[PDB]
Amino acid sequence: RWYTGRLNSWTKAVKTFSFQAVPLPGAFLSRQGGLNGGAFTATLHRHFLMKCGWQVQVQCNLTQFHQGALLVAMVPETTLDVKPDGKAKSLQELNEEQWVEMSDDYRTGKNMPFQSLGTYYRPPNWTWGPNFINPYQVTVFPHQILNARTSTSVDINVPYIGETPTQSSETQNSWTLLVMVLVPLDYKEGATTDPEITFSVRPTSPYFNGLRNRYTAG
Amino acid sequence: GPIPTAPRENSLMFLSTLPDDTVPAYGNVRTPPVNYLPGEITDLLQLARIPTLMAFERVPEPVPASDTYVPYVAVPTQFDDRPLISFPITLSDPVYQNTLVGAISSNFANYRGCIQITLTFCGPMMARGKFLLSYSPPNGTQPQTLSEAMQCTYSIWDIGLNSSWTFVVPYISPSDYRETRAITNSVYSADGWFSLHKLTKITLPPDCPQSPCILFFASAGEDYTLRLPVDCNPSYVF
Amino acid sequence: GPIPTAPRENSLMFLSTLPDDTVPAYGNVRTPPVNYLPGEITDLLQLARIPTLMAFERVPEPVPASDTYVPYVAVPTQFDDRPLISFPITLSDPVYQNTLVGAISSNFANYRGCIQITLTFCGPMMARGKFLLSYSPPNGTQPQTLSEAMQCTYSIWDIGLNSSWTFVVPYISPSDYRETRAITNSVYSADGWFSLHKLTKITLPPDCPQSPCILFFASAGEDYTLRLPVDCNPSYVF
Amino acid sequence: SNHTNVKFLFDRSRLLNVIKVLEKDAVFPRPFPTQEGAQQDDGYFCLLTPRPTVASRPATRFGLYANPSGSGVLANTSLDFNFYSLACFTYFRSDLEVTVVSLEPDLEFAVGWFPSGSEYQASSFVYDQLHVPFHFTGRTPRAFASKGGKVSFVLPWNSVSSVLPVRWGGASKLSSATRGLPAHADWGTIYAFVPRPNEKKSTAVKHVAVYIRYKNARAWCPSMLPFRSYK
Amino acid sequence: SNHTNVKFLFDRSRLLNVIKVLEKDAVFPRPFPTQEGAQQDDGYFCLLTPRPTVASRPATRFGLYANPSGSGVLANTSLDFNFYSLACFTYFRSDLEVTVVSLEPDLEFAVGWFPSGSEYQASSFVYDQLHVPFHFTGRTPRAFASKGGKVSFVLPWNSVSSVLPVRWGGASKLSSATRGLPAHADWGTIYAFVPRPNEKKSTAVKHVAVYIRYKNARAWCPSMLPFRSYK
Ligand SMILES: [Ca+2]
Ligand SMILES: [Ca+2]
């Protein structure tokens, strides 16, 4: 069955290489943007492993007299949730900032978690990381476009992936979504203003394993 | 003879795992028949499945010898909503250590398959009772409650007649094997906990001894497999 | 064993391109099936043909971020007898660099075949128009005039409905390949220029946004071929 | 040629990094964080994968000592620039060819190895007033220098994991869950030592490096590659 | 793999122990007990089995010089920790692969051998004012260093006994019947010597060790393995 949530408004203040991202299944875990999964989401904790695909939709309001462009693409094995603070994002940070813009820290991945040296070792000069983002290369991924001249919604499906045939329900975070502004928003004044966004999801062929009680507490 | 050939960067060197042999010494060698001897043994897995004794602590035993890490447990008069015995699913614990499987694995890298878990009791035969058993896969908390155990991989053993019972682990692993060494209680090796609860309290006629004893075993199952033997440590020489 | 043989002036030496292998370590090796994973990828040419984004400058963009070398261009209200955009036919330019083909070639010596050139527009759909396109082979002057472009390898794209269009270079070369590295704008590699002219000016109804945007792509064609991969540079680590 | 054949493409050797020569049983560096006074033998336990690493242990970010002075001990890392700049894909698996490269001319040495995630313990025993680090023999092979020698060898895939993720987005542990750290994605560690007793420990200083080659690999799915600053 | 195949399992080499380099015909150590003044050449007659041993003669218990000083001469022993910790069986038989390991760099040496229970006698003769220990030639093979060299070889089962008891409970002799001592369960003794006359005896001191490998073995019946102290 389908599941759906909401996302902020595409605003004129947003620019090219401005975006936001969503993790799978972390969206359900956080009920991100009002998202709710319910029965299977609770089942997650009672089953120590799982394996499934996905099937999604996204929507946003446009009008003929708008110009600008947006992009949607799934990307796996990313650490986009990690902030420069070194942790995944709570419900407040993205709900507040509402649109990320590219910077060297994410063009390099330097924000990834790191270790405390202790007094034993010299402090390094952080300069590089492998989880960078090169936006010019993202067209390789199959993707879909939402633009005033094109559409107001999109649909995509993806398979399961992972270094093992199945993975822990709690830790498996192979797939991540990102949505980015291809061209800044604009329209002759008075038209549909700063449309909001929504997203829908379905898993495909999900199979729970490792049956046990709900998540022996932390 | 003299002809262009291929050298190597490390010709004639010695590595501990050299695969081939060298010049022999002599011919005319003769050896006697071993036929009169019983049963040449070929593989570890042949013997690893024989039930071995576990080494559970003796509940603050006050003897000057102190602990008695021993395969048996005594029967309590009282019970609580927490197992008689619990332990992580980890090969490094002493009850694992001195088993056949534990001794083997102590010189291996990774493990695969499942193990046989055998159970035993030692009290007077005029006793009737039952016990609950629950394997707890990895979770966010070590099981305590009987109801929790019921949610876990669980079964109940009838002590009504048989004072012994057997069990085999299920092999669930995202990897082909699992790290044998207890480097850390991590997703690579650690696989939750076990639990043990007494289903109902004592039932005995007169003159029967009180608070009897309970015994347990362990040994490999048919599916168990290990990988990459590893070197030993001689500190026990001390 | 001991027999006359053939030595070499550099026996057992190490060159980066040694063609053969050496002694193995162990037997008994087992590996898991990768069958559950999707689509093992074998060759670069499989992916190189996916349209990639170009990096055209943002016409003196005044943002404190300064330049925005970006695949798109904006629609001008005026036009001149000189292309909207022109550039030499050379793999080293930034618009080439960060493409699939550019990233590949950055670690190759020479190139052969042809590439796909894809075009795009971003304005309101109530727009009607046309554009002229002209590839300029090497000559004594970089094309400016529309008439000059018409003499060059040229075609016209209808923006009437389709806001995208494709093109493929023709492979003309006195040599089998051409030097990939921009050592100099020389007969070995450089192959002229490209030009872009708008055929007719704007046509829009009321309420439509003004001066819309134009987008473009690039990716390898079927005939493209490279030679002799080359080593990289890590300075981007900075 | 058909160079674009990836399997053929990467089957060549390249440097990993240097390490210091050993002269006794060594204290393996402690898990982080590490404090002054916890003396340990850094710079000999040669990790075996070009991933970002630090002090014989993996790493996620890349930081380096751009400055020549400061407080504390200088760690060491390892990156395969060629392959990592050419690695526009997601998952990986292959075998690994490697060969010894001594830095000191005229060297006599012995080397050893243990696999991925294989814990280390040597200690030493006195052979007639002469300590013999246990590692002189043990579970794993060894090779020796012909007063200098190009020792070469290969190792297979070993991890319980089905494949190697080129770049990663999971979490390492149930606690202190380090993102971007797939632990079981290497081949272990080696160590080069003089064939002399601990008593024969010398004042001289020696160093050795190594070259590594990919064998019969397999690759999956796309992945990005670094951008270049336009200046 | 099928590592659990015992025959495959143990077919790898490991150190036996060190011995001193010889420079003349030697006095074999006398049978115990031995008294001061009965000067004898201890520490060169290399016994050839990892059983507990003492002064080129077998041993039953294990005792070692945990203290650095005392009265008398320090003997030497030999134990194969890996195999003896893995030896959970009763009877045994196999062949034996072995290779030389010189401790002194840049050494020139010659080595010899004689089988299990083979008594020793060399003496020496003067070749033009130069003594020639008879052992320079004799019943058994010899091998030499290429200014250093990895001399290797193998030997078969030799004892009149049908098999080798892993651990033993019989009695050695009709008199002084030492329990736990099966005498005829080894391969003999070797000896490394300089290819120089006795007159060329030098002040310098040299040492050599050896590695040993099991070949095509056969095993019978279970047996226990050591317990570990829980502390
Ligand atoms: Ca040759
Ligand atoms: Ca020859």
CSV table of C-alpha atoms in Angstrom, one decimal, chain B residues 32-229:
chain,number,residue,atom,x,y,z
B,32,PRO,CA,54.9,-51.4,8.9
B,33,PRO,CA,51.2,-51.9,8.5
B,34,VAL,CA,49.0,-49.9,10.9
B,35,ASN,CA,46.1,-52.3,10.1
B,36,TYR,CA,46.1,-53.7,13.7
B,37,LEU,CA,45.2,-50.3,15.1
B,38,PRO,CA,41.6,-49.1,15.5
B,39,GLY,CA,40.0,-46.4,13.5
B,40,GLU,CA,42.3,-43.8,12.0
B,41,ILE,CA,40.6,-40.5,12.5
B,42,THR,CA,40.5,-38.0,9.6
B,43,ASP,CA,38.6,-34.9,10.3
B,44,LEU,CA,37.7,-32.6,13.3
B,45,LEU,CA,34.0,-32.4,12.4
B,46,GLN,CA,33.8,-36.2,13.0
B,47,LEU,CA,34.4,-35.6,16.8
B,48,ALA,CA,33.3,-32.0,17.2
B,49,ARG,CA,29.6,-33.0,17.5
B,50,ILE,CA,30.0,-35.1,20.7
B,51,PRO,CA,28.2,-33.3,23.5
B,52,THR,CA,30.7,-31.4,25.6
B,53,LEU,CA,30.4,-30.0,29.1
B,54,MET,CA,29.7,-26.3,29.7
B,55,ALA,CA,31.3,-24.2,32.5
B,56,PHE,CA,28.6,-22.2,34.2
B,57,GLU,CA,29.7,-20.4,37.3
B,58,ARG,CA,28.7,-21.8,40.7
B,59,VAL,CA,26.5,-19.2,42.2
B,60,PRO,CA,28.7,-17.4,44.7
B,61,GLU,CA,30.2,-20.6,45.8
B,62,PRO,CA,32.0,-19.8,49.1
B,63,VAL,CA,34.6,-22.6,49.0
B,64,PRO,CA,38.2,-21.4,49.3
B,65,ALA,CA,38.6,-22.8,45.7
B,66,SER,CA,36.0,-20.0,45.0
B,67,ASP,CA,34.3,-20.3,41.6
B,68,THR,CA,33.3,-23.5,40.1
B,69,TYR,CA,32.6,-22.8,36.4
B,70,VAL,CA,30.8,-26.0,35.9
B,71,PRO,CA,28.2,-27.4,33.4
B,72,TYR,CA,25.5,-27.7,36.0
B,73,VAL,CA,23.0,-25.4,37.8
B,74,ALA,CA,21.0,-25.9,41.0
B,75,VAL,CA,17.2,-25.7,41.3
B,76,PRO,CA,16.0,-22.6,43.1
B,77,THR,CA,13.0,-22.5,45.4
B,78,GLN,CA,12.0,-19.1,44.2
B,79,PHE,CA,11.8,-17.7,40.7
B,80,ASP,CA,11.7,-14.2,39.2
B,81,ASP,CA,10.7,-12.6,35.9
B,82,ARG,CA,14.3,-13.0,34.6
B,83,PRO,CA,16.0,-16.1,33.3
B,84,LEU,CA,17.8,-18.7,35.4
B,85,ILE,CA,20.7,-18.2,33.1
B,86,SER,CA,21.4,-15.8,30.2
B,87,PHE,CA,24.5,-15.1,28.1
B,88,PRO,CA,25.4,-13.4,24.8
B,89,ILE,CA,25.6,-15.5,21.6
B,90,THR,CA,29.4,-15.3,21.4
B,91,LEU,CA,32.1,-18.0,21.0
B,92,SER,CA,34.6,-16.4,23.4
B,93,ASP,CA,32.7,-17.0,26.7
B,94,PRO,CA,34.2,-19.7,29.0
B,95,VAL,CA,31.2,-22.0,28.6
B,96,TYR,CA,32.1,-21.9,24.9
B,97,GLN,CA,35.8,-22.0,25.3
B,98,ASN,CA,36.6,-25.4,26.7
B,99,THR,CA,34.0,-27.3,24.5
B,100,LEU,CA,35.1,-29.2,21.5
B,101,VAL,CA,33.8,-26.5,19.3
B,102,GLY,CA,35.3,-23.8,21.5
B,103,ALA,CA,38.7,-25.4,21.5
B,104,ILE,CA,38.6,-25.8,17.7
B,105,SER,CA,37.4,-22.3,17.0
B,106,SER,CA,40.1,-20.9,19.3
B,107,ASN,CA,42.3,-21.6,16.3
B,108,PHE,CA,40.0,-20.5,13.6
B,109,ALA,CA,38.9,-17.1,12.1
B,110,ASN,CA,35.2,-17.3,11.3
B,111,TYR,CA,32.3,-19.6,11.9
B,112,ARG,CA,29.2,-20.7,10.0
B,113,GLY,CA,26.3,-23.1,10.4
B,114,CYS,CA,24.7,-24.1,13.8
B,115,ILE,CA,25.5,-25.9,17.0
B,116,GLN,CA,23.7,-28.5,19.1
B,117,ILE,CA,22.5,-27.3,22.6
B,118,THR,CA,21.8,-30.2,25.0
B,119,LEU,CA,20.1,-29.9,28.4
B,120,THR,CA,20.1,-32.1,31.5
B,121,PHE,CA,18.7,-32.4,35.0
B,122,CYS,CA,19.9,-34.3,38.1
B,123,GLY,CA,17.2,-34.3,40.8
B,124,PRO,CA,15.1,-37.1,42.2
B,125,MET,CA,13.0,-38.9,39.7
B,126,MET,CA,9.8,-38.2,41.7
B,127,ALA,CA,10.0,-34.7,40.2
B,128,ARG,CA,7.5,-33.2,37.7
B,129,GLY,CA,7.9,-29.9,36.0
B,130,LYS,CA,8.6,-27.8,32.9
B,131,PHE,CA,10.9,-25.2,31.6
B,132,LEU,CA,10.8,-22.4,29.0
B,133,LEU,CA,13.7,-21.8,26.5
B,134,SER,CA,14.2,-18.8,24.3
B,135,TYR,CA,16.9,-17.8,21.9
B,136,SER,CA,17.0,-14.0,21.7
B,137,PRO,CA,18.4,-12.7,18.4
B,138,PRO,CA,20.2,-9.3,18.4
B,139,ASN,CA,17.9,-6.5,19.7
B,140,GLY,CA,18.1,-3.3,21.7
B,141,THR,CA,18.0,-5.1,25.1
B,142,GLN,CA,19.0,-8.3,26.7
B,143,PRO,CA,15.8,-10.3,27.4
B,144,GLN,CA,14.6,-10.5,31.0
B,145,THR,CA,10.9,-11.1,31.1
B,146,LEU,CA,9.2,-14.4,30.4
B,147,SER,CA,6.8,-12.7,28.0
B,148,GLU,CA,9.8,-11.2,26.2
B,149,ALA,CA,11.3,-14.6,25.9
B,150,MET,CA,8.0,-15.8,24.4
B,151,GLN,CA,8.4,-13.2,21.7
B,152,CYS,CA,11.9,-14.5,21.1
B,153,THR,CA,12.9,-17.7,19.3
B,154,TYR,CA,11.5,-20.0,22.1
B,155,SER,CA,10.3,-23.4,23.1
B,156,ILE,CA,9.3,-25.2,26.3
B,157,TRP,CA,10.9,-28.4,27.6
B,158,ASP,CA,8.9,-31.0,29.4
B,159,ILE,CA,10.7,-32.1,32.6
B,160,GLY,CA,7.8,-34.4,33.3
B,161,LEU,CA,9.8,-37.6,32.3
B,162,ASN,CA,12.9,-36.8,30.3
B,163,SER,CA,15.6,-35.1,32.3
B,164,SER,CA,17.5,-34.2,29.1
B,165,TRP,CA,16.6,-32.3,25.9
B,166,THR,CA,18.4,-31.0,22.8
B,167,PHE,CA,18.3,-27.9,20.7
B,168,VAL,CA,20.1,-26.6,17.6
B,169,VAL,CA,20.7,-22.9,16.7
B,170,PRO,CA,19.3,-21.5,13.5
B,171,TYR,CA,21.9,-20.0,11.2
B,172,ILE,CA,20.9,-16.4,10.4
B,173,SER,CA,23.7,-14.2,9.1
B,174,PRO,CA,24.0,-11.4,6.5
B,175,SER,CA,27.5,-12.8,5.8
B,176,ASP,CA,28.6,-16.3,4.8
B,177,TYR,CA,30.6,-16.7,8.0
B,178,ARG,CA,30.8,-14.6,11.2
B,179,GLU,CA,33.9,-13.4,13.1
B,180,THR,CA,35.0,-16.0,15.6
B,181,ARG,CA,37.1,-13.7,17.7
B,182,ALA,CA,35.4,-11.4,20.2
B,183,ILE,CA,37.1,-8.2,19.0
B,184,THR,CA,33.9,-6.4,20.1
B,185,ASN,CA,30.2,-7.1,20.6
B,186,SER,CA,29.5,-6.0,17.1
B,187,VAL,CA,27.2,-6.8,14.1
B,188,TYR,CA,30.0,-8.8,12.6
B,189,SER,CA,29.8,-11.6,15.2
B,190,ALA,CA,27.5,-11.0,18.2
B,191,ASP,CA,24.1,-12.5,17.7
B,192,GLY,CA,21.9,-11.6,20.7
B,193,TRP,CA,21.3,-13.6,23.9
B,194,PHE,CA,19.8,-16.8,25.3
B,195,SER,CA,17.3,-17.1,28.2
B,196,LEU,CA,16.1,-19.8,30.5
B,197,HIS,CA,13.0,-19.7,32.7
B,198,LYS,CA,11.4,-22.4,34.8
B,199,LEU,CA,7.8,-22.8,33.7
B,200,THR,CA,6.3,-24.1,37.0
B,201,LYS,CA,7.7,-24.5,40.5
B,202,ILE,CA,8.6,-27.6,42.5
B,203,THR,CA,6.5,-30.7,42.8
B,204,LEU,CA,8.0,-33.6,44.9
B,205,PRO,CA,6.8,-36.2,47.4
B,206,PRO,CA,8.3,-36.6,50.9
B,207,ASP,CA,11.8,-37.8,51.6
B,208,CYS,CA,13.1,-36.6,48.3
B,209,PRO,CA,16.2,-34.4,48.4
B,210,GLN,CA,15.6,-30.7,47.9
B,211,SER,CA,16.9,-28.0,45.5
B,212,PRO,CA,18.3,-30.6,43.0
B,213,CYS,CA,20.8,-30.0,40.3
B,214,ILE,CA,20.5,-29.2,36.6
B,215,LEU,CA,23.2,-30.1,34.0
B,216,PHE,CA,23.8,-29.0,30.4
B,217,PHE,CA,25.9,-29.8,27.4
B,218,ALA,CA,26.9,-28.4,23.9
B,219,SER,CA,28.4,-29.7,20.7
B,220,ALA,CA,28.5,-28.9,16.9
B,221,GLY,CA,25.6,-29.6,14.6
B,222,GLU,CA,25.8,-31.0,11.0
B,223,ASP,CA,25.7,-27.6,9.3
B,224,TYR,CA,28.5,-26.0,11.3
B,225,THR,CA,31.6,-24.8,9.4
B,226,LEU,CA,34.7,-22.8,10.3
B,227,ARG,CA,37.1,-20.8,8.1
B,228,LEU,CA,40.9,-20.1,8.1
B,229,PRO,CA,42.5,-21.8,11.1
